[PDB]
């Protein structure tokens, strides 16, 4: 509350560390469904159904331009990429399996770096 604070966590490396995680996600062999925005002219149903599209290139641009206020807003966009994927793709599909694999990969890096 006013004039009553928990000890200050060092957040000075968060930006660099989120960049490194995002590099590791970009270079994973199962990243290909997530590298670029879904083409809303060419994929029937995507525009109407997926209310907030997100992809790795869009996260990279937000990261590089100071549009994440903290590491939680960064994690929310990464998770949005996988939540969107589950919404649109059957579990038993190449893209459906890609999304589950990448979400696991991300969550372990996130816990190891920050928890």
> Domains, the chain, ranges and CATH?
1-115 (1.20.920.10)
The answer to whether 103 and 30 have CB atoms below 8 angstroms apart is: no
**Angle between helix 94-114 and 71-88 (nearest 10):** 160
Query: How far, in whole angstroms, is CA 87 from its chain's centroid?
Result: 15
Which has the closest alpha carbon to 80: 62, 65, 93? Answer: 62
The answer to whether 72 and 92 have CB atoms below 8 angstroms apart is: no
Which has the closest alpha carbon to 22: 61, 53, 48, 70? Answer: 61
Dihedral sign for Cα 30, 28, 82, 53, please: negative
Number of helices followed by number of strands (H, E) in the chain: 5, 0
Which has the closest alpha carbon to 35: 50, 21, 52, 56? Answer: 56
| Resolution value in angstroms | 1.8
Number of neighbours of residue 106 by Cβ within 10 angstroms:
20
Q: What whole-number distance in Å separates Cα of residue 26 and Cα of residue 58?
A: 12
């Amino acid at each position: 509350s006013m004039s009553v604070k928990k000890p200050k966590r060092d957040d000075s490396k968060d930006l660099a560390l989120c960049s490194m995680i995002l590099t590791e996600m970009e270079t994973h062999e199962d990243a290909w469904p997530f590298l670029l925005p879904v083409n809303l002219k060419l994929v029937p149903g995507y525009k109407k159904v997926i209310k907030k599209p997100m992809d790795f290139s869009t996260i990279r641009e937000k990261l590089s331009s100071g549009q994440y206020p903290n590491l939680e807003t960064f994690a929310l966009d990464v998770r949005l990429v996988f939540d969107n994927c589950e919404t649109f793709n059957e579990d038993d599909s190449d893209i459906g399996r890609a999304g589950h694999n990448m979400r696991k990969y991300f969550e372990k890096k996130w816990t190891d770096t920050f928890k």
